[PDB]
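User: hey, got a sec? need Antigen, P35 folded
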Amino acid sequence: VDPEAKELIQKILDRSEDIVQISEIDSNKGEPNDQFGMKAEIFSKIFFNANSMVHFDDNEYLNERRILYTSLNFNEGVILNLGTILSKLSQHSNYRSLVKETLINRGFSIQLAMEEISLKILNVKDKLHHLNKPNLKTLYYDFDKLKTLKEKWLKDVDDIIKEYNANPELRTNISKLHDNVELKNSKAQFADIHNLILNLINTTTNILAPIQ
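Assistant: Yep! Here you go:
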């Protein structure tokens, strides 16, 4: 194991162990009863899965909600603030499925992908040395690619908050708030996020198949 392969193995494990450690530390912070003020108008009004007879506010979904909070760095301030703003939108069922799509298909999915890839790698931790350098670099740089998506998500979320707090029209013209959010969360963007994660998860799985 030459020095390039060594550092590369240590940094892959570091990034993996960071993500999963953050997740267990985020996990035993618990949550408010009101789920950061998103229960009443968002979580209690969407299904996480068509086959469940309960809504997203159910205790069944503690961990899924935790993943969404970790997707915003578990910054309470930001989650309350975005909670209040998306809650104004999802009061109108005509606009509720943009809030769902934004929360679940963006924040949740990006963070889920980081954690699943981390767990896949740590699951074969002792055998990463058997891998070639191109495959080790794909693993290493894959973390940088997911980080960009997470960075863009946190950016769009801070901007929504900044703009909502700077502009009275976004607080009263509900159809203007909708437009602002939709521009930041286009259907093209949702497909790019979906397809990137799909082929990062497939590529990771293929790379690890022989050390399994």
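Quick note: The domain at 1-212 is CATH 1.10.3160.10 (Bbcrasp-1). Let me know if you need anything else on Antigen, P35.
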